[model samples]
Target: RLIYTAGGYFRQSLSYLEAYNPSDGTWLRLADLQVPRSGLAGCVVGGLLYAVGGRNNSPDGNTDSSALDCYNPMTNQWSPCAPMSVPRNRIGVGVIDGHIYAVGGSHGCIHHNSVERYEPERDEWHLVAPMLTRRIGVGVAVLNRLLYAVGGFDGTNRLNSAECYYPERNEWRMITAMNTIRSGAGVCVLHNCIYAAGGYDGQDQLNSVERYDVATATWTFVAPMKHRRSALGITVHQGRIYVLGGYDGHTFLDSVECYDPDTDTWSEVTRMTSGRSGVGVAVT
Candidate 1:
């Protein structure tokens, strides 16, 4: 099962939710979100779906929301959880040991370096050690129990730098920078390596892909995608990496693409019903 939550355009934050069944290749509409938002972060922990901070439409103006909502698949309900201390949008979330860590994001005008950890048992969020550099639209993943924060923008430059978090030590260390500077890339882990897909490099949408070797502390270029994409959703299922909806500079995309690391190639898949940018995807 693949779950997609709220995502929308300027002046319109969406509450729509949908689930995709891989076996049948069909999509089923699900319950709407409690609030309409875009650029939010979503992750599944213990069978429950969590939607974190994002930007939403407001009468006064567009506003950043600290709101956190949890959805129970069994009950088919959405409910509030503890809100984040700081409001953010485009945050990257990763789960480890039953906790969800919300990392770097933007607050509309400002980029953030804050990192917060959520405790489901208490329904609370605590400030974790902040990232070394402030960023927005980063790619995050849990590899070998450590959280990796990849390329993103720090308000001015498209960043090529990367960093990793050590939960036990509550420390963050700089890692190898990517070959290309990018923001809003889709990242996923496969066969013990972190693969970063297409994103924008400040000047243009990118189709270039690269993989980080944790053991070697280095990066290597991989096959490029058919379309340049930024703010895409990526997940690993059945040994292949699926890169979903995103913007390709000129237009919002519904096109889906899959990469087979074993073959070192990419192929176009069936497109989604609706075009989306900055989408979130979770696999169960």
Candidate 2:
């Protein structure tokens, strides 16, 4: 099942949760989120989907939430987890070595540089070393054993900067910046490299895509996406990167697309029944 959750529609946060079956091309309604939120982050760890902090208001609203919730597929239920140390929205989340790290985000007018690690077994969160820059709308993914934080908004500007956190050293180091400055892009790792896809680059929505080479610590342009998107959901399954729903400034998108890293190309997939942005996606 591929699950999607809370997002904004008509300036209101949605509590809807839906699951998709690629085999049948069907979508099933699931339990609604405990709280209505947009700009939330999610990841699957140990067969559970962890929904992280997000705001209850539209993009400009001051309200930010620290709520952490988990969904169980077997029972089709939602449960509470320990809240984050600080309230945030538009954050980045990545799971590595059995730990979920919530990276930089924003709380109303403030951008965050702090990091937190959640231990599922203890149901608790611990503060980790801060990143090199304050950011929100960032894309995070695990490559090898390190967590990579990609492009995002840093309050004053859209950023092209990237960084990697080493759990063993409890340290973060700057990596090569993307070719384009953007926020709200979908990021995932494949074949030991990181791919950063469509996003808003401060001035306009983007279809441009780029990849980071870990071995050489360099960024290179790849084939662009067919559509421009921001705040989209992305995941790697069956060796292809699935880019799900997002906003294009003017409208929410329901169209789904898939990318082939080997061929360096993108192709449209089935479209969702409803257009959505600020949504979370997970595959099992």
Candidate 3:
């Protein structure tokens, strides 16, 4: 299967990894993201990949991007798509039906409630209902039939609150808050549980971990990471949860960790080729 990952600094490539087996933790390298960009939103739909806004957060000279790109791993190529109506960075992307939805991020502000939708067939973007609450550094997941956004910074404080999107009504409804409030945590779902790991705790780097069960509507604490991390990335393939590179504020991380839900434990995995933060991943 095909998986998408964010890479690069100002110029970043989305590295594609193939997971042949979950039991053995085997991954094969494939291709890279088309536009070399970072802190952008990305999602895969019907085997096709879509990416949206990202930028260089330089204060004196900020380079804000609203450009969108699509990739076809089958052909190992990428093509230009439409841009978001509202330009921003570190946006969240998720697929509903065949359309790609863009969620909150920031340009001048930290949290933006803006939302947009991209139609591949038309190569166009459209506005959608804005999120009920503003979110930046948000993690999004399409669980069951709804889109759930979790763990983000609200400009003033790290947020534990989450919201769900109801496509049928084109509206969002609030959900239970997370146990640990985080800004740039790594997120992944495995065995119907939404696991959030590694992020800043407002004052310091965090190695805490927590998971929410969709069926029971409950949150449970899990084993913490070996290294404190922020702006981390996570994905699930087969049955294992793979957490990749992140920063401990002082330095970036190339280390990887894997968690087995059955044992509720963590084991060190392979080190990434590069140390990075503000990452995204998809597992096929």
Candidate maximizing lDDT: 2
RMSD of 3: 3.0
Q: Residue-wise lDDT of candidate 1 within 9-56, one digit each (tens)? A: 433666777776556667777788877877777888888877887777
Q: Could you tell me the TM-score of candidate 3?
A: 0.87
Query: Candidates' lDDT values, in order?
Result: 0.83, 0.84, 0.72
Clashes of 1: 0
**What residue runs in model 2 are displaced by over 4 Å at the alpha carbon?**
1-10, 57-61
* Candidate 2, 56-160: lDDT as tens digits: 754464679888899898898899999999997888789888888999989868899999999999999999999998889999989988999898888888999
Clashing pairs in 2: none
Ranking of all predicted structures according to TM-score, beginning with the best and ending with the worst: 1, 2, 3
Of models 2 and 3, which has the larger lDDT? 2
**Tens-digit per-residue lDDT, 89-108, candidate 3:** 76666777788888888777
